[PDB]
């Protein structure tokens, strides 16, 4: 109920002064307003890192001073136990001790006996601390254009990126979450450079009248410390026109892009208060764009601060989802980074649950309810793939309190009490399970009741906010798991604690061997199918659910399930669907019109198997039907789910030409976009199975024929084929799958080759108003998917043929586009990115030799992120297959040394996804000194951020996980 944390707190004041751009430092004094809890509260602890304190003071009494950093290495630097398990446990205990959620110490000012007798008298104090941030080496950012003479004035900006509890790394506070306070914030700014934080513009004129300005932001609304952040330098645009108080801040010469970008935001606020039945529970909303991100999402109080990649300025169609997509997260988590708030790290999951689910609800009623369902399927893709890579993603209420473990999910690392142990794979899947468990709460409970719950939540919170600080009666904004659950059951008490102990408290994905049987195959037994499952490693047994079956033209048959899963079950039987030449359509689903006796229709009154098409249980369903039923489901079904899963099932085995026919038929209607993209890849696989069975044509050329008439298109489709965004994605996708079409003589896509080169010829002028950009990019990736591994039979790597022949043509085109985007550049060098992937795939077939120095020259500093990020993916696979020790050393040195966080994040992420030096396959000899430097980088050089050494934990997970590395 209450915090086990003493010394309640009310108010705090910051005052940044003397912010430097040359030695690049910040000075400031903080004051704190504390009601202590018990006497002898002497060694008062706050916490920070990378903070040289200048002085401490309580009421003109500089009291004592304790300053440790056990967030640094092991107490002995050569603790030879250099494996995972000891380090994980030791680091877990270490940073748990760093947390003040116990009697601890990082900043323990000791109360003097004078002030202790005052505590005996009055437990009300003020705390004044002078301190100075240095060059911030893991807490802040000073984005500086490398000019330093004049453009250091106009061209730089300054802010704070960081994770959840990175307020420590900025200015000293508590365990930064779950301490309800209010703030007055004093900001020493340039008169031009505008600084934006939480709260309100409460006191600012041309301030202090000397040379600069100084801002007062007061947040009266009672929040916690991990919401506070200050972006200094941009330009103001109120992008108000519909809702009058919506505030935006961007770097100069980026401004009118916001004029396209920012809008649709009003519609989102309209949506959110259609949900919540409040107002936007604040004064205003503030948004900062920045060339960097520790995290792309980042969302704080009244303010979302995130990257300048999401502008999508009016012509750049493919960020039509993405921009407002991410804007949705930067509102929803906003509210639950506002008000609802975790009582512990082990209490959060409801927060990200309801936040992500709410913007899922947004994605329903904004665009693509079928793309909504598609998004859910990708969620299951991420979750199933990760918890079959790894162990579970569990949502504890449970501690290992008393030095206990209780962690089967310690397949790598700690989770229970701590954010800063986890992987981004883990933290991402945490959010993904959060979405889907809220969908299960839909599955047991009305959406209207969800509105009821959330309105009660925010009513109690906004009531408990904005007052005189009701003393001892204020922490109702900690709305964590237990009382939330209680409020759910107060709205409707159902058996949702089984829902918890299934999904919240048994992190297991469930496959399904629901084995198809066929009764009423003129069978005495009638319409029966068996239930089956067992598959450990990561299994889970979920029993009582139901089953969704479509008849021929009839009932959605739904059938119960049980535990003790060696089961056989029936179907609520269809009629005697006989004389079905006469029973043409006895009402399939509404007025749908279909006739085929093409299936095994002597005695097949069935059409389709399903378990829970609304995707209730975390599933990976394995079964078998007649292939007719799969293909006919692809003739039509009312689920994108069903359509792409029959897409996968028919990507496995078959090749009739009727399959090809029904595929193409599916591609030419109004059905769905991405359905057709995976249908293209169906044609790719099945026409690759057409080597001896080349029965159909050179495929899909006819699809560009019969679907595309510019001016009836006399044999070639060229021009202006946009504004119909079905066709946009479809033309963007199809030639890639055409470049896959290969039959084994030399895999010979020669017609397709020359055809795609012709596609690259016939590109449009400014008649297309839509910046003919990504179309180029995926035509280039089709050329990258012209993978020709087997030209160099003996030695042909080395300028020998000026290697030949069509490879050279592909080289001509990619050389052209690289120099065009060096000259034109169109939008993020996205073309250049696809080019770099293409050039690496050319090295992976030995045509341009395996040399990294190009990619090395695109991993450099002064390029874009995305260029640099793709070069790093490339050189990671280079060091994977080729055995370059030296560039690996370079890579790790740059993991140490570069200013950008997000490259370090993605280096370590896809380094771990795509490893060299793979465990117990050690030919390139990590044991020599590489384990040593890696152990160092786990210990040293990585106190900048948590997640960098979390990635290093992932490195030692993959590379030599649960053991000595076979050194000594």
């Amino acid at each position: 109920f209450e915090s086990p944390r003493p010394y309640k707190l009310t108010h705090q004041v910051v005052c940044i002064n003397n912010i430097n751009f040359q030695r690049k430092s910040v000075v400031g004094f903080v004051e704190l307003t504390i009601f202590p809890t018990v006497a002898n509260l002497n060694r008062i602890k706050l916490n920070s890192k990378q903070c040289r304190i200048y002085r401490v003071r309580i009421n003109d009494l500089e009291a004592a001073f304790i300053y440790n950093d056990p967030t640094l290495e092991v107490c002995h630097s050569e603790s030879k136990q250099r494996n995972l398990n000891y380090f994980s446990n030791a680091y877990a205990a270490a940073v748990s001790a760093v947390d003040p959620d116990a009697g601890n110490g990082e900043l323990c000012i000791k109360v003097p006996s004078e002030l202790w007798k005052h505590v005996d008298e009055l437990k009300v104090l003020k705390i004044h601390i002078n301190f100075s941030l240095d060059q911030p080496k893991g807490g802040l950012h000073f984005v500086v254009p490398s000019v330093e003479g004049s453009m250091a004035e106009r061209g730089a900006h300054v802010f704070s990126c960081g994770y959840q509890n990175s307020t420590r790394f900025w200015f000293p506070c508590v365990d930064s979450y779950s301490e309800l306070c209010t703030w007055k914030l004093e900001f020493t700014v340039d008169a031009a450079m505008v600084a934006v934080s939480n709260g309100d513009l409460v006191e600012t004129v041309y301030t202090h009248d000397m040379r600069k300005k100084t801002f007062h932001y007061m947040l009266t609304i009672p929040t916690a410390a991990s919401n506070i952040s200050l972006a200094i330098g941009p330009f103001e645009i109120l992008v108000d026109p519909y809702m009058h108080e919506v505030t935006h801040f961007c770097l100069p010469q980026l401004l009118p892009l916001l004029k396209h970008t920012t809008s649709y935001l009003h519609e989102v606020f309209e949506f959110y208060e259609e949900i919540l039945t409040c107002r936007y529970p604040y004064s205003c909303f503030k948004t900062v764009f920045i060339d960097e991100a520790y995290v792309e999402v980042a969302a704080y109080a009244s303010m979302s601060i995130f990257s300048t990649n999401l502008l999508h300025s009016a012509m750049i169609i493919d960020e039509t989802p993405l921009t407002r997509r991410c804007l949705a997260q930067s509102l929803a988590q906003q509210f639950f980074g506002c008000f609802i708030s975790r009582m512990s790290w082990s209490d959060e999951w409801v927060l990200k649950g309801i936040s992500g689910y709410i913007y899922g609800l947004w994605m329903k009623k904004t665009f693509g309810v079928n793309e909504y369902r598609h998004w859910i399927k990708e969620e299951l893709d991420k979750i199933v793939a990760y918890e079959l890579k790894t162990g579970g993603v569990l949502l504890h209420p449970i501690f290992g309190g008393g030095k206990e473990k209780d962690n089967p999910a310690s397949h790598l690392h700690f989770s229970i009490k701590h954010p800063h142990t986890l992987s981004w794979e883990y933290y991402s899947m945490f959010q993904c399970k959060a979405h889907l468990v809220m969908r299960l709460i839909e599955n047991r409970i009305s959406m209207e009741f969800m509105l009821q719950v959330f309105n009660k939540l925010l009513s109690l919170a906004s009531t408990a906010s904005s007052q005189k600080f009701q003393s001892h009666m204020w922490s109702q904004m900690l709305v964590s798991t237990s009382g939330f659950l209680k409020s759910i059951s107060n709205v409707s008490g159902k058996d949702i604690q089984p829902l918890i102990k299934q999904w919240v408290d048994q992190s297991g994905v469930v496959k399904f061997y629901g084995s198809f049987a066929f009764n009423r195959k003129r069978n005495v037994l009638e319409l029966e199918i068996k239930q089956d499952y067992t598959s450990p490693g990561t299994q889970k047994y979920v029993g009582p659910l139901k089953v969704t079956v479509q008849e021929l033209d009839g009932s959605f048959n739904h059938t119960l399930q049980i535990e003790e899963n060696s089961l056989k079950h029936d179907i609520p039987c269809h009629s005697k669907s006989r004389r079905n030449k006469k029973k043409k359509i006895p009402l399939m689903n509404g007025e749908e019109v279909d006739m085929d006796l093409s299936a095994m229709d002597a005695d097949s009154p069935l059409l389709w198997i399903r378990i829970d098409p609304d995707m209730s249980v975390l599933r990976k369903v394995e079964f078998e039907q007649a292939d007719f039923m799969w293909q006919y489901q692809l003739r039509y079904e009312r689920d994108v789910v069903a359509q792409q899963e029959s897409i996968l099932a028919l990507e496995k085995f078959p090749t009739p030409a009727s399959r090809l026919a029904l595929t193409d038929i599916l591609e030419q209607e109004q059905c769905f976009y991405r359905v057709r993209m995976s249908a293209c890849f169906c044609l790719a696989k099945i026409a690759n199975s057409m080597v001896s069975t080349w029965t159909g044509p050179p495929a899909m050329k006819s699809l560009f024929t019969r679907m595309f008439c510019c001016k009836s298109c006399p044999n070639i489709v060229k021009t202006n084929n946009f504004m119909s965004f079905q066709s946009y994605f479809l033309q963007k996708t199809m030639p890639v799958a055409m470049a896959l079409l290969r039959d084994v003589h030399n895999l010979c896509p020669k017609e397709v080759l020359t055809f795609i080169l012709d596609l690259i010829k016939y590109n449009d002028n400014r008649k297309n108003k839509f910046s003919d950009n990504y179309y180029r990019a995926e035509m280039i990736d089709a050329l990258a998917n012209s993978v020709t591994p087997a030209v160099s039979v003996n030695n042909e790597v080395r300028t020998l043929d000026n290697l030949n022949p069509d490879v050279r043509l592909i080289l001509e085109e990619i050389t052209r586009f690289l120099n065009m985007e060096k000259l034109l550049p169109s939008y993020r060098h996205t073309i250049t990115v696809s080019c770099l992937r293409a050039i690496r795939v050319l090295q992976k077939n030995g045509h341009v030799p395996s040399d990294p120095a190009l990619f090395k020259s695109y991993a450099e500093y002064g390029h874009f992120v995305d260029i640099r990020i793709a070069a790093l993916e490339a050189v990671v696979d280079y060091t994977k297959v080729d055995r370059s020790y030296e560039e690996l050393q370079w890579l790790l040195n740059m993991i140490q040394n570069d200013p950008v966080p997000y490259v370090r994040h993605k280096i370590l992420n896809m380094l771990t996804k795509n490893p060299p030096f793979t465990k117990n396959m050690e030919s390139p000899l990590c044991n020599e000194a590489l384990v040593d430097q890696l152990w160092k980088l786990m210990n040293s050089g990585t106190s900048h951020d948590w997640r960098l050494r979390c990635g290093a934990v992932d490195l030692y997970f993959t590379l030599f996980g649960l053991s000595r590395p076979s050194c000594l």
């Binding site: 980026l254 892009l257 060339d291 502008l311 300025s313 050389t815 060096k822 002064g862």
Partner: peptide
């Protein structure tokens, strides 16, 4: 220098004002 002389990298100071400019 004959067949494929790709331009090397510039890298310059401010990438975003360039790559995000219609």
């Amino acid at each position: 220098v004959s067949t494929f002389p790709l331009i090397a990298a510039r890298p310059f100071t401010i990438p975003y004002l360039t790559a995000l400019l219609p």
